[PDB]
Symmetry: none
Subunit: 144 residues, 4 copies
């Protein structure tokens, strides 16, 4: 099964590649935003939304990966190898889950259509070469 | 954040641990069942069901966990350690994911209420002394 | 004060004295059935049923007995004495609390009248001599004789 | 499970911790009161009240604990460890069970709301410093 966790919603892994890897906030900041804005909804026993379901699952997924990495590192005896494996994790699983959490939190806060239009607009902005790129990058906001 | 994944479906980790650990089919068997029965639905751009969303997320998480495991295993060179770490990841993460995939596949196939009643019935059955319980173990079936 | 814990429910200790020890699941299995089936109602702040009240009190006192026995054993210095106290508790209080928890869980699941009818039938079966009673004991279950869920 | 034996009624263990450990009457006095006032109600085949159910269970299971304690003491070696066992049984199980018996008997006799109000009032009384603490400790009464 070649499953794309976004085509269920309307985006694709290549639509989120418009945003660079250095754009997404850290996992700590994303989970803090989740606990701040959507905590009661996430622990509610209701199917509040597909975004809520996917977000619950993703949070538990990162919990499992962090448990595994912590146990492996605790049993590990070589700190250089520990740094290498934590860099590998943060590079691949870290980036993938930062993408997932950014997408779901933003679709909950501002809206799925707005998030997809923002993806297209930021793709345009980041494709435009710097000499002709506006200093005001596009951003999701509920204010003028 | 204290997220219980089964809660939004009406179940609990206490209810899925109410069944034995060696009852749940292997992760390969469950993934094969998923690919054989609901591949076109898991790869389709539709919120077919909360079970479909949770199943997509669980499959992707198992892929990521196995990716981390095989990467660290290929980079390491200790066979006893391979055995220890594979046993650890199995008995914890593989058990959690066996419970998850079993629950979701069985729900999609038979019914959420049917799966919950099966949980309670099979638990009481395994706990009842043999001479005072029905001789055959309970099992879910589509054939009338 | 000559209190019968089942009398308020219409059963009696003489009616539950026919069920053999092998008929009841272990105290751990019964407490697990409770925790997995009616935990939300047993921890709730509202009276749900006389069975729920009696079951709460039974679980609490089983815990207290267990803590007492654990303290006694930890203090004690003889392995044979530890085995003896464990055997005594498991044959005197273990069986009684198995009876109580089984009764209340089964009344919550199936029904009080159904448990009482099953007790009468099991009494007949268990008092009938072996060469004259059917080989399979009467069964109180939530499943048919095929044990296949659809 | 975290079953609180008073939660279904309206009190908690945090609420009953207001009263000290030396305040509750002895199990003998509590069982004598229970007998004299509600023997026919606790021996009757009726769910007269959740308080009656809890009181029946408490009486029988305290008798169970006493049977275990007497067997252990009869089998034990020396009066030193015997009195140590008895002191442990008292300070923990006897205290908890006279808490339970006091709560349910007082509820049955005066009223559940009255018992909870009495708990709050006794908390206030026991927190007030002695120089300003009245000698008339709060007491449950009908007349």
């Amino acid at each position: 099964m070649d499953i794309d966790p976004y085509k269920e919603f309307g985006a694709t892994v290549e639509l989120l590649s418009f945003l660079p890897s250095d754009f997404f906030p850290s996992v700590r900041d994303l989970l803090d935003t989740a606990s701040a804005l959507y905590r009661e909804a996430l622990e509610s026993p209701e199917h509040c939304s597909p975004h809520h379901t996917a977000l619950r699952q993703a949070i538990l997924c990162w919990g499992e990966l962090m448990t595994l990495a912590t146990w492996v590192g605790v049993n590990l005896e070589d700190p250089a190898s520990r740094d290498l494996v934590v860099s590998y994790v943060n590079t691949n699983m870290g980036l993938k889950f930062r993408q997932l959490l950014w997408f779901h939190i933003s679709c909950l806060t501002f809206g799925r259509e707005t998030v997809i239009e923002y993806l297209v607009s930021f793709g345009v902005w980041i494709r435009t070469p710097p000499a002709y790129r506006p200093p005001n990058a596009p951003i999701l906001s509920t204010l003028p």
